[PDB]
Design a protein around this nucleic acid. Sequence first.
RNA 1: UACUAAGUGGAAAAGGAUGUGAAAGUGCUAAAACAGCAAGGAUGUUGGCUUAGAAGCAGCCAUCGUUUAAAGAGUGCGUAA
Lengths: 128, 176, 37, 69, 126, 138
Amino acid sequence: IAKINLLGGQAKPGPALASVGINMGEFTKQFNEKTKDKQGEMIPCVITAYNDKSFDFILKTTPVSILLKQAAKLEKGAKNAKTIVGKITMAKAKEIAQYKLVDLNANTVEAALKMVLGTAKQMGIEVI
Amino acid sequence: KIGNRTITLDPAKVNLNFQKDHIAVKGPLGQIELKLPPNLPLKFELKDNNLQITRNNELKQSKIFHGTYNALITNAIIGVTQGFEKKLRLVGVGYRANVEGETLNLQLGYSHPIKEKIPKGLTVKVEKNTEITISGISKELVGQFATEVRKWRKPEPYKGKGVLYFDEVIVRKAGK
Amino acid sequence: MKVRASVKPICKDCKIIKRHQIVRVICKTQKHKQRQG
Amino acid sequence: EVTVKVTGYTDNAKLAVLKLYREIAGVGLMEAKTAVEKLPCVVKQDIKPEEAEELKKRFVEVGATVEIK
Amino acid sequence: AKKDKAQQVADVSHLLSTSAGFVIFDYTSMSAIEATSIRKKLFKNGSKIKVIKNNILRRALKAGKFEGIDETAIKGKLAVAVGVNEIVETLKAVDGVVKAKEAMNFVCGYFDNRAFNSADLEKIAK
Amino acid sequence: KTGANFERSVQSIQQRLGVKAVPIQLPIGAENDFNGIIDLIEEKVYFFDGGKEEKAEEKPIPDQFKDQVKQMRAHLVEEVANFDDQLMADYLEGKEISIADIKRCIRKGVIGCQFFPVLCGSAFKNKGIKLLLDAVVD
RNA sequence: UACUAAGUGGAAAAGGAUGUGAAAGUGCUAAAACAGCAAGGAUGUUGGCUUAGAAGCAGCCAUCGUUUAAAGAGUGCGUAA
């Protein structure tokens, strides 16, 4: 199998969803509708075995450290915490917290906020 | 340590005679005598449906030997109870295997017929002309047989063509 | 292996042993296998 | 699940049922040749009722006493 | 030394005695994925799931108004499924964790102490 | 040579191409001793003449190989039966497809690319060129 | 009596040696740790920059959040990611 950091629209590139046992386009048509509500930054995608692969496909929450960079209005910051240049706003912070709450091993929103700030120190943003 | 461990004994299926020179495990597959040093100072306490062997003498050799012979007695008991089997996969397009009676023949790039010595006491089978199956009732003989088989043509470090143990991690160098 | 005069465990598997009274290092890293330590 | 059964042949009309089986099942000469030669042959397995009745109409338009079981 | 194990035996004994629904079961290992999933089901419920020392669980069930001398001291990964707050929520968590695995061997403990059933326990739990 | 086979031929002709090469020739000798051919349209043939070949030493279909040739004959007539469906009917009534019809159907299957015969031969003991040319003419 | 299995005696150097027995300080376990294994050993995360997706792991780092018995952007392997 293979987990990919796939796109939100087309999923054509990558020899990991094209041939794991399933045909590309007949799942791509599902990808355009199951992920059209999960667009934005590159969203994770996990493949599994139904028979070998045709169903049972769900998307994990987006890796919010480059979506967190986009919350800082950024694509490249640094490799370590640096001077403050962006700020994840109230609505963005709360929706990211509730977004990660189910992906994480955590139970509380405060653990989500600790999560978001914990990867926030790789580009140099403070998660409020 | 396995000195702390205990060996579950089968005193009715495999008679375990603790002759220090030749520990005799006698089961349905005959009787194999592990040749240990004559009159070992080590004591091999054989209880009923239980075994425990310790270092009666206190030395590095005896400290080695207690665990050595604990594992050895385990191997001997299970080998004379069911037997030991080793599978060798001669994965090659020009390398083949065969058995004539109890002679294991190899087919190399050689134009030379190849045979293979056995630490006898084992049966070697090649039903499909590519796999070698060694059955035996002594682990040392089986292992030496496998070593003597693999020293004919080990799989090439560059391509997996040779007599693997089916899990032999071949070192990979580059020449192309 | 190659003849040396001092064995150094430059690999984690470099077991300093004595085969036929020849002191060598046996290890997975065949590059580091030597002799006569 | 229902499977199509090409058991009978209206006036022994295996004539075209070879050809239709070949074109619709994507099988070689072997499969149709050895299957629709005999009555109890399992031409298809685990097919949905819609595709089963499509096979029904095809097999009867080329001529065969076909059953759905 | 063994004194440390002794007071922490006592601590887990109090922990098992105070709780009413404490249904601990070994099931051929408990996964960190399983712990994650079951604790998400327990979100906010400050109760924990773990596998811990056999002696301490032994005397915890022994001192938890039950018997655990060898019932929950053997068989590898002895999962500790205890509950906090509402007895209802405890029972629901126990039933959910039983349904988490393929077919779980009811090992030790019970809801409200002193087990009389093993199949009705899964029925009371749900 | 050391490493050749017949199953290798019919499997490589498929994994490389996949054209359903129907083996009308069964090589007597398949690894480093190819000196004979077992034919379906013709009879079995050996080759006593290494190097330069002039004679196709044909041999009949004996009791030890009647079933060996018969299984592949059924193999071939099960394809040939689909063409000229009167052959299919004949297979209902158990009549083996005539060799002339087999030859015409193989001619159609090579000029129409339906199925081709995969013959066998050698080039270092130089065996298997007689029936090669025979099938080429056929 | 403590030691040796090198005949060390009865040759030996820089250097190197998970050298033998014994012994001085440092821990748990005795309830059964530790070792191998039954096995859980996870999670954001393909975090980004370069490198194509090297992005658990061509390489760098903030490596912090969390479920916990345990966890590491992983001991690493496998890797196109």
